[PDB]
Amino acid sequence: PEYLSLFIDDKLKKGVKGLTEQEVETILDKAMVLFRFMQEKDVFERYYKQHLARLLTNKSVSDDSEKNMISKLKTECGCQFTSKLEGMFRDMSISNTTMDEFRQHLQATGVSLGGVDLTVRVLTTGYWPTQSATPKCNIPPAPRHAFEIFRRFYLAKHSGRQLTLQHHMGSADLNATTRKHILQVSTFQMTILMLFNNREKYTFEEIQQETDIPERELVRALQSLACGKPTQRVLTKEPKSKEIENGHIFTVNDQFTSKLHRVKIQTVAAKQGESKVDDDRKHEIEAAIVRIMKSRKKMQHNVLVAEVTQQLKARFLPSPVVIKKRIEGLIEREYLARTPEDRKVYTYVA
Amino acid sequence: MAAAVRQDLAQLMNSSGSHKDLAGKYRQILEKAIQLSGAEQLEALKAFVEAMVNENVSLVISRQLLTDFCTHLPNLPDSTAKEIYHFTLEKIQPRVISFEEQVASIRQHLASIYEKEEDWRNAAQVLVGIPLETGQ
Amino acid sequence: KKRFEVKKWNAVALWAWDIVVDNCAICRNHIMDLCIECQANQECTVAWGVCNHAFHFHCISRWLKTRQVCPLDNREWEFQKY
Ligand SMILES: [Zn+2]
Ligand SMILES: [Zn+2]
Ligand SMILES: [Zn+2]
């Protein structure tokens, strides 16, 4: 299923070769029928989440083809997961309409700090995947004030929610040095350069002291800003080495080199992707098995789900999805093989 | 006529040098400015407080110096302490995130002084206004 | 003339309800109560659904005894997140 999701993402990413919708829809029909003979769509859709997380970047898709394939999938799949993918699409659309509304508001009531372009793309928490609690990297003054005015606007209109700005994902550009070259940075690099600006001769510990830079994912970015840069060579460090522990002093240099005015460091995205639950899962499996054999209480279709979670003392341990999958796979032979048309007799209390 | 502290602060905020010892220098200023006089002491303290609030000043140095300034606040008389508390709170409310570590302690001390003077309504509204759960 | 000027920023937010839940709408008591029936006679937990509708376990159980829909949204109720 990971391979099928990879193939689907690869085909939909580049629609130039075979822009006709007929060949694409026949490929999708083949994929759908192949998935039909298979089961366990949970890993399939979490892989969808992984590929669409790393949609968050530039679209580079066809959109309407995704809508058609998700509609044809929902026709034969049902709800919940199909509804949350519909939530993905609805969230993206409502985000772009809210962005249009905010732009209209800025045009109507002029704000000087709105001169910088804002492309807020707020998401939802109940449907989108979660990565972690995210760090608290410092924001430069002007972007901080722009996000503050956006927060003030969003707290108006419809209330009852807040915005916890993240820093893992994001795309930004910066004008640098001499002809003015436009560089592409992704959040953390922007703050690093902003700190570099106000004073030269900045060392790594000084940067780490007041930027709240991450620890584990810092490794990918640290070895991406140097140690294998392309011919653009925007920035280099004087302690040229494969590893830089604590006191590698960084220096700002012109390094005009390439004449291109849209030098981008997006290539780091092409290389950063590379590279005890035992007791908990044993306890969960044992609890589910003892619940499924022991209960045997009078149920029709749902009160068994109530009593099984009643028996446990602590919650989030039941996880009704496991009960659902257990009772679904429990129909293989006589026990719990009752008639779907009338789900009345369920061995009653035996 | 108490322009000595004012000129010292002015010389410090125009200091181009950002060496590590500067913070220590500021501490020296504190140990020469905690004790002085009456109303002009309040003037020096308010000039000090509005000196840290500038975004040009280093955030970590300003924050640590703000904690050092705050530790001596309870010894001040009630009225001056309340004035400085409200001044700090109104200076912090634009940039809440930059000083969202000691605002809780300042509000706690303010609420303690209110509850020790029977004025519970102001402490109640202050502790309503603190963004504890909403903060990341 | 600042050394670097920000021109674009694609921020990513994550909206969540300011109040997750404060009341079980079968007994008018908050979710950490005993659902009145357990308060009088003394275990008691909360239950959730796909619509993210927190209720007392006993309240939703006695509702499901004779009914099959969520009390608030009046659609098919099924258990999720215990
Ligand atoms: Zn209840
Ligand atoms: Zn109860
Ligand atoms: Zn409901």
| Continuous segment of H or E residues that includes residue B12 | helix B4-13
- State phi, psi for A89 to the nearest 5 degrees: -65, -45
C-beta pairs of C49-54 under 8 Å, 24+ apart in sequence: C49/C77, C49/C78, C49/C79, C49/C80, C50/A80, C50/C78, C50/C80, C51/C75, C52/A126, C54/C20, C54/C21, C54/C24
Which residues are within 5 Å of ligand 1 (an ion), measured at CB? Answer: C 24, 26-27, 35, 56, 59
Return the biggest CA–CA distance within chain C. 73
Which value in Å is the resolution of this experimental model?
3.9
Phi, psi of A124 (to 5 degrees): -115, 155
Could you tell me how far CA A339 lies from the centroid of its own chain?
A: 41
Cα distance between residue A106 and residue A99, in whole Å: 10
Phi then psi for residue A226, to 5 deg, are -155, -170
Q: Enumerate the residues of chain C whose CB falls inside 8 A of the CB of residue A302.
A: 64, 68, 77-79
Chain A residues with beta carbon closer than 8 angstroms to that of B60: 209-210
Alpha-carbon span A305 to A320, nearest angstrom: 7
Q: State which residue of chain A sits closest to C66, comparing Cα positions.
A: A303
> Do residues A249 and A241 make contact, with C-beta atoms less than 8 angstroms apart?
no
- The residue of chain B nearest to residue A152, with distances taken between CA atoms, is B94
Q: Inter-chain contact C17–A56, Cβ cutoff 8 Å?
A: no
Dist. CA C34–CA A97, nearest whole Å: 44
How many residues does this entry show for chain C?
A: 82
Q: Which of A111, A190, A263 is nearest to C8 (CA)?
A: A190
Distance in angstroms (rounded) separating the CA atoms of residues B52 and B31: 17
Give the three-state DSSP class for B42. helix
Cβ neighbours of C56 (radius 10 Å): 27
Please identify which residue in the block is written with the tokens 């011919």.
A231
Q: Could you give the CA distance from residue C66 to residue A302 in angstroms, rounded to a whole number? A: 12
Residue A242: exposure state from Cβ atoms within 10 A (0-12, 13-18, ≥19): exposed
In 3-state terms chain C splits into helix, strand, coil percentages (rounded to 5) of: 15, 20, 65
C-alpha to C-alpha distance for A52 and A55, rounded to whole angstroms: 5
Encoded tokens for B59: 């955030």
Residue spans of alpha helices (H) in chain C: 37-40, 57-66
In angstroms, the first-to-last Cα distance of chain B is 46
Give CB contacts under 8 A, 24+ apart, made by A148-154.
Answer: A149/A111, A149/A113, A149/A114, A150/A102, A150/A118, A150/A120, A150/C11, A153/A102, A153/A105, A154/A122
Residue C5's alpha-carbon distances to A140, A177, A266, B97, in angstroms, are 10, 12, 19, 22
User: Do the Cβ atoms of B51 and B57 come closer than 8 Å?
Assistant: yes
Question: Which residues have C-beta under 5 Å from ligand 3, the single-atom ion?
Answer: C 51, 53, 70, 72-73
Distance C75 CA to ligand 3 centre (A): 6
Burial (CB < 10 A; 0-12, 13-18, 19+), residue B22, is middle
Domains of chain C and CATH, by start: 1-82 (3.30.40.10)
B15 touches chain A (CB under 8 A): no
Residues of chain C contacting A56 with CB distance shorter than 8 Å:
12
Cα distance between residue C19 and residue B11, in whole Å: 50
Are the C-beta atoms of B126 and B110 separated by less than 8 Å? yes
Q: In this complex, which of A138, A164, A210 lies closest to B136 when CB atoms are compared?
A: A164
Phi-psi region of B77 (alpha: psi -120 to 50; beta: other; left: phi over 0): beta
Burial A181-201 (b: 16+ CB within 10 A, else e): bebbbbbbbbbbbbbbbeeee
| Closest approach of A195 to chain B, Cα-based (Å) | 11
Which residue reads 């009704």 in tokens? A320
Q: B65 near B26, Cβ under 8 Å?
A: yes
Residues linked to residue C69 through DSSP beta bridges, in sequence order: C76
Subunits in contact with chain A (3 or more CB pairs closer than 8 Å): B, C
| CB proximity A176 to C under 8 Å | yes
